[PDB]
């Protein structure tokens, strides 16, 4: 499985695609590594595991037009069977997602008083929005930091969003008329259940 | 100046021209940094730089032809006054060298035809105009590596002024000859 990772910081999350890859868990490779941000600490992660990097910045690109077209150039060079976001802070063009929707893949710190956990989604419109395959969700106890409940949430995104791509691994997921499709059933917006 | 520089290693050349340009002495910028080696050291000065990173890899193509098109795509997509070399080890194409033609610049180890030099690149036996040698003193005792220290150092110091004079618009090159100030420069560069 050709796994094309964007990412515009920690790379915490693209870590743990990367181990379940070396571990075999998802039977795929991540074959490059795309920031849009020239510091992010996850390139670094990448270059140790050596994984090839691009960089692209904005400022480098006189329309945000430019700025996808060449972007969507490297991408598809590694010729990507999903492209996960696994931390992109960038506002998507139809273009982008089109070219992508259907491998294209993101996850939230949040679901789609109050409760906490993550949800991981197909792309499929420029506002990030798409069918749920998996929601997760973090308790909070009675007195943790904001910090705790952080890492709380942090973890869950290691466990799940790794497996929500094994399923694309294998095959079991497909996103066709704008719904999420998990071994031939449907899935309800709340995801797999 | 907008500079792009190229490597596959450890990149203190790189560093220096990083620092060069944050202080001033060579007017211009590192745009973007490409390397061949994805565990390239370099690749992570660059990033506390906060210079963009790019890597291209051999396996990742099918052909030279391939890999050629795409790296001097990617590089000239940063418009490169100076595409710099330092230590790109790579067997460079025909096309890319007469692309970047005069003013791609690149460091050697010995003097031409121990020290450095700093010359342009081109399409010539010898191997293109040199710019500036610099050679390192050695004695015996020296061994291999000090006197491989010795010369590192003396990169440092060297590369950045020819960058920086580059970039300043003095250092020129034209009929396979390195001018400097309007004025031919000779064989062993500005001694």
Redesign the interface.
């Given at each position: 499985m050709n796994i094309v990772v964007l990412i515009s910081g920690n790379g915490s999350n693209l870590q743990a695609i990367i181990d379940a890859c070396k571990t075999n868990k998802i039977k795929g490779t991540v074959?490059?590594v795309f920031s849009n941000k020239?510091?992010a600490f996850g390139?670094?992660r990448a270059?140790?595991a050596?994984?090839?990097?691009?960089?692209?910045?904005a400022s480098?690109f006189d329309s945000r037009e430019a700025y996808d077209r060449?972007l969507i150039h490297?991408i598809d060079?590694?010729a990507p069977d999903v492209v996960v976001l696994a931390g992109f802070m960038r506002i998507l063009s139809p273009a982008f997602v089109s070219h992508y929707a259907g491998r294209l893949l993101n996850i939230h710190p949040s679901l789609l008083d109050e409760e906490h956990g993550t949800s991981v989604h197909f792309v499929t419109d420029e506002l990030d929005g798409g069918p749920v395959i998996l929601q997760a969700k973090v308790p909070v106890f009675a007195g943790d930091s904001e910090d705790d409940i952080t890492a709380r949430v942090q973890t869950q995104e290691h466990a799940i969003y790794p497996l929500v791509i094994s399923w694309f691994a294998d095959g079991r997921l497909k996103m066709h008329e704008n719904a999420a499709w998990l071994d031939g059933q449907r899935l309800p917006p709340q995801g797999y259940a």
């Open positions: 074959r490059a020239a510091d390139l670094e270059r140790q050596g994984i090839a990097t691009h960089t692209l910045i480098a060449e490297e060079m590694y």
